Nucleic acid binder design. Structure first.
Ligand SMILES: [Mg+2]
Ligand SMILES: [Mg+2]
Ligand SMILES: [Mg+2]
Ligand SMILES: [Mg+2]
Ligand SMILES: [Mg+2]
Ligand SMILES: [Mg+2]
Ligand SMILES: [Mg+2]
Ligand SMILES: [Mg+2]
Ligand SMILES: [Mg+2]
Ligand SMILES: [Mg+2]
Ligand SMILES: [Mg+2]
Ligand SMILES: [Mg+2]
Ligand SMILES: [Mg+2]
Ligand SMILES: [Mg+2]
Ligand SMILES: [Mg+2]
Ligand SMILES: [Mg+2]
Ligand SMILES: [Mg+2]
Ligand SMILES: [Mg+2]
Ligand SMILES: [Mg+2]
Ligand SMILES: [Mg+2]
Ligand SMILES: [Mg+2]
Ligand SMILES: [Mg+2]
Ligand SMILES: [Mg+2]
Ligand SMILES: [Mg+2]
Ligand SMILES: [Mg+2]
Ligand SMILES: [Zn+2]
Lengths: 78, 98, 60, 121, 206, 24, 116, 155
RNA sequence: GGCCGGGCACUCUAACGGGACUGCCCGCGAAAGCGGGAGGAAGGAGGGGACGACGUCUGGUCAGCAUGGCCCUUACGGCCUGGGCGACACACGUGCUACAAUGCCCACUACAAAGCGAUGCCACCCGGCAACGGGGAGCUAAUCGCAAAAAGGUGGGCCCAGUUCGGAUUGGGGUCUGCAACCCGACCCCAUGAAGCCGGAAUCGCUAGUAAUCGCGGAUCAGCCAUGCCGCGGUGAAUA
């Protein structure tokens, strides 16, 4: 994919800016999920829209998988 | 001096749009090699006849970029005279290089 | 949305990618001769109409 | 003198000597370099006797490849037969005096290939 | 059910273009997007005098709006004032040398796109549509013509069935290429809806 | 065949350059 | 030689019969061992087979070992599970090709049902 | 072919042996149009001819092209019939066009690995009896005389 | 490898012209026209195009657009951001690649045609296994680039094995575009190498430079899911 830049985002890192600053509980709603696996988030807060609601599930160190909508579905089953 | 590229779309005005320039030749002083028509290359475009639910044949039709060019070995300033006159192109763009 | 649209093509205070070829004489967002800024069917008239120079029924 | 096939254009100029036949800077046998179909263009020479009384400097350009070889067929025996009135006595007779408009036809008409129409069911 | 346009057929032959110039691919687009909004503000304004043509020439940073009519008067006006501001509206859009001209068609009963533009008003005027046709063609074939044909859309009223009104005299061939057959079209917005008219005037075979 | 990529015929048909069709 | 006996054939291609040794890694690793890529896989001395027999099974990973490593990138894939993680839990295209028509090679053969 | 009869194409004579019956053969050997490959195989096969039988790979081509010429056939045209197969006579023409065609598939139906070593390797068989070709023509021929009863309305 | 001071036979170019008309031949009877000679690059519209009567299906299309009517007018209009059109137990039409040894691969080696290039084509060296990148060329292009066409041709290796066949799938890297390729891009390298030994009932295409077959161009395009599409050429059948 990309190789120049952390191909991450910008406009909601400022909400993560304080991932090491204030006190750092949870809850954090994005929309542009294009963000790559934000690489400094332990037991944190997936909170990703997908048309529907924002999806919440854990985000641990191995979890450093791909992006964000990676763990945010958009569909239906069988 | 005398390589001059008579461009254009309109074609019957290039056998005449040049035959008239090559006669500033036989008036100014230049045993001029007449119009050399370097190859036409054409930008044709094919397009679906109907506005919905045709698809099989369409009608093509071309935009024949025509082209010619002129020459000699003799370039006096009375040449410059005629070339500022006798200009009869409806829409036949023409440039000059030395 | 049909008209409020054409002036999304003309404004582009948005990235290079958000841009395209809405026609002039009509708005068809599809099938657009680059060099006329137009449409398979708009064009195909002005031609028969002969309000486009040079173009005419081909063959070979 | 000259000949054409599939817009294969073959300039044929003939001079006497013996066994000399070269084209685009290759000897005609290293030009096709194995292609025994090819060895057949230089065969009006055989039509009435002219085995080796006429060598060949020809320059073919454009058009085919193996059909480029038939291009030297009426490039030869038509620039060649230029002299001798009594010489056409084997080119109209023996069928060797034609261009053959057998050329690839225009792909057209929403077909796949100017004939092969799409499938059907 | 086909009949491709009767001119596109004869567009580089027996009918010279309606827009004569040449432009370099890199710019041709703009020599059109500009080139029509003239035609798209002249047939608009000069409908009054009734124009059959809007031939447009150039070859530099200029213009050549040789607008044809068969009745100038309303084009030039008196002394020259409509035509004077018209050649300034034009350079209000095309910041160029808006060089205009005028014609009087030697016969209007021999311009199709007039004949059409005419009958299509008789339609907007709630008139005998068939009769309109029997006369329109009679107009043309009397003022010297080898053939002539008009064909109306196919309405007249109601809320339903729509037909087509067809009549003609002389001959109007079309698998004949050396044809020279002027064709015109015109709309006609009634309370009912739109109609059309195909104008077919056969001047002569070159 | 015109679908292996990793071949002469592979990249030729797809018309891509690669280790196996560098150029000429 | 990994875990396999390949006999009458080309060392060039023989070594490829191994999961994790392709036609490439057999010529580039043949440089390394410096053997002849055209000689049969039988004409190589016992004292010199051990070119390969100490080489490529040590240059990296392959059968068994590397075989096993491929599935670790998939147990990984139900971390949270990606869209890419799931589509083995449902046996479907993970590049994301059309799962309408075709997509057959990932989910068995046509299990046919009734219609309209 | 309802209007006229359609033209028989006169073949561009063999590019070595001069003989049209030798072009017609290499023709029915060319997959697609690589032609070069088609006449290699054939000429290759004449070389294989020389190896095994010191005859002229030309009469080896004849006592073969006429061995596998079916005398007659069953034109089962459908007039009235639920499978009426009135047999008749084979044309000089069809005799050859079939016989050629037969020899090439009969060659390709053999388990020898190099298409050259095949196409003469039974072009030899067909030549005094024998050969997948004459069989696939023997059958053919015995289909008539067996269906002789329907001679009555031959044509 | 005109690389040339010089030249317009040729080549191709690209304009305006000639040329076929059924032509003198006992076999058509007043006829028309059909034969089988001659010359011709050429014969019975010469290949083929564009062209498609009155009408027909109240066919298609109000989503290109036009347009009467009807209905919505802090919403049936407007913007944004994310999603979707890409879903998958399955059924079809069109296709692409094949199951191979007339074949598949690594070499070198020929031989086209139409077209396209100022956010181009990018010649040529550097880098890199390469995609590509750093650079930097001639470029308004018959005069430089796309470009190298592939079958072909040689010459070498595979020896009927699901294989040096087949390229699916998944793992891993890693490029260009692009604000951003999770959903969803194309490409590249490594490794995985699935179904598939010629396809039931059935069913399509073609008159010859056709079918088959081989690449190439172009449109649209930031890039691209093109195997599609219109083009163009290479080799080139069978049969009536
Ligand atoms: Mg776009
Ligand atoms: Mg030509
Ligand atoms: Mg050919
Ligand atoms: Mg072709
Ligand atoms: Mg009613
Ligand atoms: Mg109608
Ligand atoms: Mg009312
Ligand atoms: Mg392979
Ligand atoms: Mg993919
Ligand atoms: Mg999908
Ligand atoms: Mg895909
Ligand atoms: Mg026959
Ligand atoms: Mg008579
Ligand atoms: Mg007569
Ligand atoms: Mg004709
Ligand atoms: Mg869709
Ligand atoms: Mg396909
Ligand atoms: Mg196929
Ligand atoms: Mg070349
Ligand atoms: Mg640079
Ligand atoms: Mg893949
Ligand atoms: Mg960018
Ligand atoms: Mg036919
Ligand atoms: Mg292509
Ligand atoms: Mg392109
Ligand atoms: Zn349009």
């Amino acid at each position: 994919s990309l190789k120049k830049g952390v191909f991450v985002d910008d406009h909601l890192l400022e909400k993560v800016l304080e991932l090491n600053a204030k006190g750092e509980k949870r809850l954090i709603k994005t929309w542009s999920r294009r963000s790559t696996i934000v690489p400094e988030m332990v037991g944190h807060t997936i909170a990703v829209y997908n048309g529907k609601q924002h999806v919440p599930v854990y985000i641990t160190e191995n979890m450093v998988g791909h992006k964000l909508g990676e763990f945010a579905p958009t569909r239906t089953y069988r | 001096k005398i390589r001059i590229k008579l461009r254009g779309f309109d074609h019957k005005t290039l056998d005449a749009s040049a035959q008239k320039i090559v006669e500033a030749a036989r008036r100014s002083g230049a045993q001029v090699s007449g119009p050399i028509p370097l190859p036409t290359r054409v930008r044709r475009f094919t397009v679906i006849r109907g506005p919905f639910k045709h698809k099989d044949s369409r009608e093509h039709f071309e935009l024949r970029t025509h082209n010619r060019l002129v020459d000699i070995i003799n370039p006096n300033r009375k040449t410059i005279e005629q070339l500022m006159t006798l200009d009869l192109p409806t829409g036949v763009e023409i440039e000059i290089k030395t | 949305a049909r008209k409020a649209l054409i002036e999304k093509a003309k404004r582009t205070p948005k990235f290079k990618v958000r841009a395209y070829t809405r026609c002039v004489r009509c708005g068809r967002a599809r099938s657009v001769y680059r060099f006329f800024g137009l449409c398979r069917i708009c064009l195909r008239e002005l031609a028969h109409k002969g309000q486009l120079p040079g173009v005419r029924k081909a063959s070979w | 003198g000259t000949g054409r096939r599939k817009e294969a254009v073959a300039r044929v100029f003939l001079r006497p000597g013996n066994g000399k036949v070269t084209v685009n800077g290759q000897d005609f046998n290293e030009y096709f370099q194995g292609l025994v179909r090819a060895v057949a263009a230089l065969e009006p020479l055989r039509a009435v006797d002219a085995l080796g009384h006429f060598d060949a400097y020809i320059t073919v350009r454009g058009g085919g490849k193996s059909g480029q070889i038939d291009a030297i067929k009426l490039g030869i025996a038509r620039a060649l037969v230029q002299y001798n009135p009594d010489y056409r006595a084997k080119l109209k007779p023996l069928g060797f005096l034609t261009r053959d408009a057998r050329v690839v036809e225009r792909k057209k008409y929403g077909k796949h290939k100017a004939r092969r129409a799409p499938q059907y069911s | 059910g086909n009949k491709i346009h009767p001119i596109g057929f004869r567009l580089g032959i027996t009918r010279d273009w309606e827009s004569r110039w040449y432009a370099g691919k890199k710019q041709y687009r703009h020599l059109l997007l500009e080139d029509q909004r003239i035609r798209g503000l002249l047939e608009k304004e000069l409908y009054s005098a009734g124009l059959a043509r809007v031939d447009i020439e150039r070859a530099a940073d200029n213009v050549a709006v040789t607008v044809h009519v068969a009745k100038p008067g309303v084009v030039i006006g008196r002394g020259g004032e409509r035509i004077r501001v018209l050649r300034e509206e034009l350079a209000k859009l095309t910041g160029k040398n808006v060089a205009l001209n005028v014609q009087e068609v030697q016969n209007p009963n021999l311009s199709a796109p007039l004949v059409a533009q005419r009958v299509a008003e008789q339609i907007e005027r709630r008139f005998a549509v068939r009769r309109a046709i029997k006369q329109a063609v009679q107009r043309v074939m009397e003022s010297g013509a080898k053939g002539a044909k008009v064909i109306v859309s196919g309405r007249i009223g109601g809320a339903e069935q729509a037909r087509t009104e067809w009549a003609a005299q002389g001959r109007v061939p079309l698998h004949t290429l050396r044809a020279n057959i002027d064709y015109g079209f015109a709309l006609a917005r009634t309370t009912y809806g739109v109609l059309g008219v195909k104008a077919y005037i056969f001047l002569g075979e070159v | 065949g015109k679908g292996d990529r990793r071949t002469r015929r592979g990249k030729i048909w797809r018309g891509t350059y690669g280790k196996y069709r560098p150029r000429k | 030689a990994g875990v396999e006996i390949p006999r009458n054939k080309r060392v060039d291609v023989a070594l490829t019969y191994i999961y994790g040794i392709g036609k490439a890694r057999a010529k580039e690793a043949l440089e390394k061992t410096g053997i002849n890529p055209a000689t049969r896989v039988k004409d190589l001395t016992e004292a010199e087979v051990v070119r390969l027999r100490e080489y490529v099974e040590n240059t990296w990973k392959l059968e068994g070992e590397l075989r096993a490593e491929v599935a670790a990138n998939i147990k990984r894939l139900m971390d949270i599970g990606c869209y890419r993680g799931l589509r083995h839990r449902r046996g479907l295209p993970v590049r994301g090709q059309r799962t309408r028509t075709n997509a057959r090679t990932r989910k068995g053969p046509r299990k046919t049902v009734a219609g309209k | 072919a309802r209007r006229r009869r359609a033209e028989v194409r006169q073949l561009q004579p063999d590019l070595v042996y001069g003989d049209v019956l030798v072009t017609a053969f290499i023709n029915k050997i060319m997959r697609d149009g690589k032609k070069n490959l088609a006449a290699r195989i054939f000429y290759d096969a004449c070389k294989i001819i020389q190896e095994k039988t010191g005859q002229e790979p030309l009469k080896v081509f004849k006592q073969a092209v006429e061995n596998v010429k079916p005398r007659m056939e069953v034109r089962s045209r459908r007039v009235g019939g639920a499978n009426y197969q009135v047999p008749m006579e084979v044309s000089p023409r069809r005799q050859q066009s079939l016989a050629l065609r037969w020899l090439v598939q009969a060659a390709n139906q053999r388990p020898e690995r190099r298409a050259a070593v095949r196409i003469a390797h039974e072009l030899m068989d067909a030549a005094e009896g024998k050969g997948g070709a004459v069989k696939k023509k023997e059958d053919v021929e015995r289909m008539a005389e067996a269906n002789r009863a329907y001679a009555h309305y031959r044509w």
